Amino acid sequence: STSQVRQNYHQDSEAAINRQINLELYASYVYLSMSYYFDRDDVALKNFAKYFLHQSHEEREHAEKLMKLQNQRGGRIFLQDIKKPDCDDWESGLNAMECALHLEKNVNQSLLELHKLATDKNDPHLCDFIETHYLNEQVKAIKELGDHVTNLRKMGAPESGLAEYLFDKHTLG
């Protein structure tokens, strides 16, 4: 029962896109959790909260765009549970930034494995899709998180609550 639209779209690619959909939903969920950590009355860094909420919404958009892709190509979306984040308590602004950096590196590695697969299956439409909409976004995200981690370290986080407060106001404000 093949889709009338399907062309040059390997089953392995189809499956790999479904996995990537789950990973983008998971990254949305991590960032949601981080957001509301910083909204706790005992953490209380509102621009950290807003920053990660925005990232959360971005990752949901990234998921949606892969769902759209799956249907554009005539594959079939298969959803899996979205796992809860590894931590409930993210410790400090610095530790959350470090965790986001690791998350985005993990997501980039997935994307790079997906692009290898697409390359191996000679799917230039999928290669272009990944390159256009995902790989440079990931390089920018990683670089931004790296920059944030550096500033926080240099300022004396996580031990200086002053450092995290002023970063919240100047960089994320």
Added chain:
Amino acid sequence: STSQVRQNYHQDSEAAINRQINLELYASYVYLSMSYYFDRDDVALKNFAKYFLHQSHEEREHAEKLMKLQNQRGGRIFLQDIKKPDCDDWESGLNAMECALHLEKNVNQSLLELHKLATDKNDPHLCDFIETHYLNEQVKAIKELGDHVTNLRKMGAPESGLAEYLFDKHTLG
């Protein structure tokens, strides 16, 4: 280690709000799945797709607002996995509408159990919260879905593909 803000907020209520957060995320996920079903090339009802996407985004907002509430009250958010939806293939516009109706009735029952709990624990702030932001939204959603199911039936869905097409254009367009 009690929150400095916490007042008149029972542990049972705290836990019940965490459960409700998960249920709202789950409802967002159901609607996401339904949305992209209708975007499939072999279904191809774009206003059904847009309608459920909007509902999906609404449920995410409902979840966020409960997270905000949890922190406002000094409870602690505890996230759980977001289960995949029961179906991958929703059959027809009518069947998806019927499923959404059942979902929203289920969510309303949860909210009503939460309100009972709040009432039992004499938490009028929580009672007001639920009444203001959730109970009439649920009554309107249910009523809207009921109306949609009726129209679709009366028009001859799910067997008339014409019925579903014209409903898509006139009611959801």
Added chain:
Amino acid sequence: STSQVRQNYHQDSEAAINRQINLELYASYVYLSMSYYFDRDDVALKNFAKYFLHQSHEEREHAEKLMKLQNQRGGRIFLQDIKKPDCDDWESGLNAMECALHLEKNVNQSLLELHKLATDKNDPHLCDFIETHYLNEQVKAIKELGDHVTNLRKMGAPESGLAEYLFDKHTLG
């Protein structure tokens, strides 16, 4: 044959809402009658007439909103005759105001009995509905009518036709 939308909505509540619909229509009719009393050539207080017409239209809106509620909840509207008002001739501006005060107190008592019923049947949606759209409107109406009755008395109504005339121009104008 239960409505697909109905949930947590007791038959007693359903019936009580139908009674309240009739009472709001009746209050609209009382105010209509009062309005046109003041439009008589031998009464001739045009702002009393406009004031009660507006109240009449308000009560019709209150009825409509309860009809909407009945359907939102999946109950079935059952209409009864709208009784004529008790008086054809309302005597004076003061006496009409006094009668309106008594009418609004009667309507408030009905609403309060309805809210008791809803509370007894653990229907927080209905409780919220009544509180949001009816109970403070009734407290404001009562207070306004009380104020009007006082001013009229203090000014020397109903014996001073001058008092009623100047109240018409200054308070209702």
Added chain:
Amino acid sequence: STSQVRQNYHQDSEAAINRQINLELYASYVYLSMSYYFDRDDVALKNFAKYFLHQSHEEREHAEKLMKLQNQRGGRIFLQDIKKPDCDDWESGLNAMECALHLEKNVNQSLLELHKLATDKNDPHLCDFIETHYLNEQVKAIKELGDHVTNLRKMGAPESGLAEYLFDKHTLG
């Protein structure tokens, strides 16, 4: 005790205008009932609902204008109970339209009997009033309802739920 304004206004005319006031209130009530039938979750034709609500409000205005007339002429308004409509359940859009057609024909017959009376009592002001504000409005209403009934029949109502749905969108939308 005759009104200072009264002139050429027969007691029979006075009474007949009071009857007509009641009939216009009754027609408002019929249309109100029909409106909210179509707002039921198991009927769910929102432009039928809006259409009859508007008609309901129009009939209330027609009543008010006769009340105004009664006082302009120095007659005395005497109100009677507004009877509930004959049906609670109006069956279908077609059947409601048919019922409205019959209602408006009934109201027109009353108006025509009133005009005969006025003619017999040589009251040209009342004749003009009826002709100017009522008789052509009734001829237009009747003609409009006839047209609606025809279209619905021709489209295959009441058995085609599709017909009623598309009429709702195209003619009443």
Added chain:
Amino acid sequence: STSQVRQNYHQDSEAAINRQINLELYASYVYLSMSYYFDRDDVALKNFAKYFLHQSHEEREHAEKLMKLQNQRGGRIFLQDIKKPDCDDWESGLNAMECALHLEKNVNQSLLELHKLATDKNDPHLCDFIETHYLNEQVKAIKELGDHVTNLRKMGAPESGLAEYLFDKHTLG
């Protein structure tokens, strides 16, 4: 000698509202005192001063609204002395914030006792009043003060005069 407007309004509720009026005036007075502490030449934190002045004005408004309520319901306002605040010298920005947090928790407890009373006397209008205009305002105030106390602590107040200065500029500015 009962008020013509009074209905379903228990004497105990009446008295409890008078007590709450005094408590809101007292909270206005505390915040006034705190405001002008920060305007002292040896304290000199102008946005702390403005912040508490605004809170002071808010509490006066809360008092006024309860006075309005008392009259709306036909109770009789009975005023008592407004006690001076417990401290003349509030120590530091952090200590004032901590004191405000405790004050607002105290006021919330009063409101919650008032709502219990209203619930016990089956006064849903009063329940709604308290829920609508007071309980969520108190939850937001408490949460805001908690957040402020946290930031100040984390920044190194009250020992760091730098911390209090920069908080004044970034959070309260």
Added chain:
Amino acid sequence: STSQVRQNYHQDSEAAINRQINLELYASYVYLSMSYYFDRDDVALKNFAKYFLHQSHEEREHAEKLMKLQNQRGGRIFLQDIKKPDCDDWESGLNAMECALHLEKNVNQSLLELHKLATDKNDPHLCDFIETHYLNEQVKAIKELGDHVTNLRKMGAPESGLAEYLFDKHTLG
């Protein structure tokens, strides 16, 4: 421990300004009480109510300005309880106006004693302050209240409820 700013500011002046702060708060409280008297359903003179509310807010501003002065000069604010007003029930519009006149004369006498003190202590800054911001405001307030009392008397208050009603509309409206 003298303030770094303090110069030519006698301890007696400092104390006298604290007393005057209390008197201005007390006058705010009197006017608040009077305001809400006229908002009672059995008094019901809304422009009397608004008039005294505005006066109440003005007196609070006068207090604030003295607090500001105390700090400008390097004195230390010391607050005392704000006594409840002498009356709960102010009788009539005329009697309230008479009471306000006496209150403002009392406040003026205090200000004049303060100015004597400042003169005796050769504090021309304080003299100027009092003259600029308080003495002519008091002369205008007194004159205005005198005028109001006269009109009310001349119109036949407090026995004519008509007089008080029309004054409310024409002078305070």
